[PDB]
């Protein structure tokens, strides 16, 4: 019934929402748990880290954890070896080129909000996102 | 200055 | 020709009391 505009507040690489998100979120009116539970494992087990944004639509007086990434940090996703980094490890400069298929095969989800020319624009704009690589596709 | 007394010549 | 007269003063010093006619 009740619905409201999203706030997309997350900014963490952590699993299961906050360190203990399951309990504080409850209110006096009460609410029914959904995506906050096991569904996070679908995200943590596949799209871990990279501070993915989460829309809060609340379609039925309850939390709704959308799992879709925006951009920017997405360029980092193209790597096969992310076994944490703990803390204070010299900012861990993890980088090593990128797959040649960085084009529409990865950018297909990015098309929803970009506008302008396709091949002259949206496919080209992702190239500037890869400042973190420091080596380019070459 | 001659020394003496009585006479007025003294002190001259 | 004023008349000459003497008078005693401090520390035994003598000073004139001459008349002026």
């Amino acid at each position: 019934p009740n619905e409201i505009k999203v706030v997309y507040l997350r900014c963490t690489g952590g699993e299961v929402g906050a360190t203990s998100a399951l309990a504080p979120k409850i209110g006096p009116l009460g609410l029914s748990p959904k995506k906050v539970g096991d569904d996070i494992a679908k995200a943590t087990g596949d799209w871990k880290g990279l501070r993915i944004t989460v829309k809060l639509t609340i379609q039925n007086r309850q939390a709704q954890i959308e799992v879709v990434p925006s951009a920017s940090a997405l360029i980092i996703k193209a790597l096969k070896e992310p076994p944490r980094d703990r803390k204070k490890q010299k900012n861990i400069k993890h980088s090593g080129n990128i797959t040649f298929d960085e084009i529409v095969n990865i950018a297909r989800q990015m098309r929803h909000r970009s506008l302008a020319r396709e091949l002259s624009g949206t496919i080209k704009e992702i190239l500037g996102t890869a400042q973190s690589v420091g080596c380019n596709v070459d | 200055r001659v020394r003496g007394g009585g006479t007025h010549r003294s002190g001259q | 020709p004023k008349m000459r007269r003497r008078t005693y003063r401090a520390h035994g010093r003598i000073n004139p009391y001459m008349s002026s006619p």
Binding site: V7, L9, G17, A21 | - | -
Partner: protein, 431 residues
């Protein structure tokens, strides 16, 4: 230099593991060797203790004491000269692992110097004397003015230390003088003036260093009147002038005068701790005065405030019965963490969730005060400790539960899932 602080945390872990340790009988042997004192004399007195231990009305206890003595003796031999910040030795034969008993020795060089002796071969380690070292005590630089130079000493709980000392010629009384003794008074005022200058500037070289305080003392101490013209002069100090404690008369003068200045500085230190307490709590009273609500108290909202942006001034009393015991199932089917108020400690209802009825098992003790100590820097702001000794402090305890803090800004009570997530996911943003 943060790694040295990590070493300090290691020293704290050593103090915890040390104090936790205990041993039956008088066999246990604590020891503390003072700075600037020969080790060999301590070896002689320890030998006298070995002679005292030569006759004991017990079997195993005799061999245990003598063995601890041989242990501290063999351990002592590695040193050749007295270590910096003194020496602190512990020895014994503690029992662990379901009554298993083993000999143990503990050595470390403290980050913070201490100047006291403490030999006491009785049960349980006497680490309380080291607890004063655990605090981040400020250096207490003390200036001891005199008519024949001045003594730039310091204090550090117990460790007195004279950073500098000197003597200078004094113009003194004009004496029989002459028709113009006043010019002699002018040269007197001039030498006194230079004494106000180059000496205090040398103090600027030896204390403030570089726009950062190294001392909280700067206590005056002089049999002569110079201290009265010291605090009352433009040439004195910037900012540091407010750090002055109280005048300290010295009947003998000199280093002995610095020695009386020690304990007198201790009582006036109690005084300025009183002002510091009344101020640190009084600013919180000023926060109470505002209708803006930029304040927090109790175990309730304050924790959620810690979850978000750090409180501008955390304020927590020492003793606190509440403990942060973890609520983690052995099957890990439901992680949980919550504060344990004493009524809940009696009820213990929270251990048994209605969802399954399983009771969470304890893993390791996690006291709330140490829980503040574990990573207060990570939480932002700075940790603070308040005593109940102040009259305002008792009001802080009985009137607020002994815990609270100054918020950077006002916070509303949570309500509905939207605002509740607006606060909680924001807490995640601050984490």
């Amino acid at each position: 230099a943060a790694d040295r602080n990590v070493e300090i945390w290691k020293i704290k872990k050593l103090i915890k593991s040390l104090e936790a340790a205990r041993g039956n009988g008088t066999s246990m042997i604590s020891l503390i060797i003072p700075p600037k004192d020969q080790i060999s004399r301590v070896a002689k007195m320890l030998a006298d203790e070995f002679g005292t231990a030569s006759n004991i009305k017990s079997r195993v206890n005799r061999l245990s004491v003598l063995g601890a003595i041989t242990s501290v003796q063999q351990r002592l031999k590695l040193y050749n000269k007295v270590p910096p910040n003194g020496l602190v030795v512990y020895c014994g034969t503690i029992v662990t692992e379901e009554g298993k008993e083993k000999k143990v020795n503990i050595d470390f060089e403290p980050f913070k110097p201490i100047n006291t002796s403490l030999y006491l071969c009785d049960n349980k380690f006497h680490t309380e004397a080291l607890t004063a070292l655990l605090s981040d005590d400020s250096k207490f630089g003390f200036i001891v003015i005199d008519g024949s130079g001045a003594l730039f000493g310091t204090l550090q709980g117990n460790t007195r230390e004279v950073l500098h000392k000197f003597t200078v010629d004094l113009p003194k009384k004009h004496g029989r003088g002459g028709q113009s003794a006043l010019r002699f008074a002018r040269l007197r005022m001039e030498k006194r003036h230079n004494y106000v200058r180059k000496v205090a500037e040398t103090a600027v070289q030896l204390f403030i260093s570089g726009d950062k305080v190294n001392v909280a003392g700067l206590v005056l101490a002089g049999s002569a009147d110079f201290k009265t013209e010291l605090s009352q002069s433009d040439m004195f100090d910037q900012r540091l002038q407010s750090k002055v404690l109280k005048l300290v008369d010295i009947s003998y003068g000199g280093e002995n005068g610095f020695n009386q200045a020690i304990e007198l500085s201790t009582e006036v230190l109690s005084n300025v701790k009183f002002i510091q307490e009344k101020k640190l709590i009084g600013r919180y009273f000023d926060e109470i005065s505002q209708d803006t609500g930029k304040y927090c108290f109790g175990v309730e909202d304050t924790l959620k405030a810690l979850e978000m942006g750090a409180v501008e001034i955390l304020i927590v009393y020492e003793n606190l019965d509440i403990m942060r015991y973890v609520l983690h199932c052995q099957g890990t089917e439901e992680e949980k963490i919550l504060y344990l108020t004493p009524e809940q400690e009696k009820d213990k209802s929270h251990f048994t969730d209605k969802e399954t009825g399983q009771e969470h098992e304890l893993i390791e003790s996690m006291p709330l005060l140490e829980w503040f100590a574990n990573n207060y820097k990570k939480f932002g702001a700075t940790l603070e400790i308040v005593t109940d000794k102040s009259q305002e402090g008792s009001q802080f305890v009985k009137g607020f539960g002994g815990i609270g803090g100054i918020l950077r800004y006002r916070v509303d009570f949570q309500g509905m899932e939207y605002q509740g997530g607006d606060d909680e996911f924001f807490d995640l943003d601050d984490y």
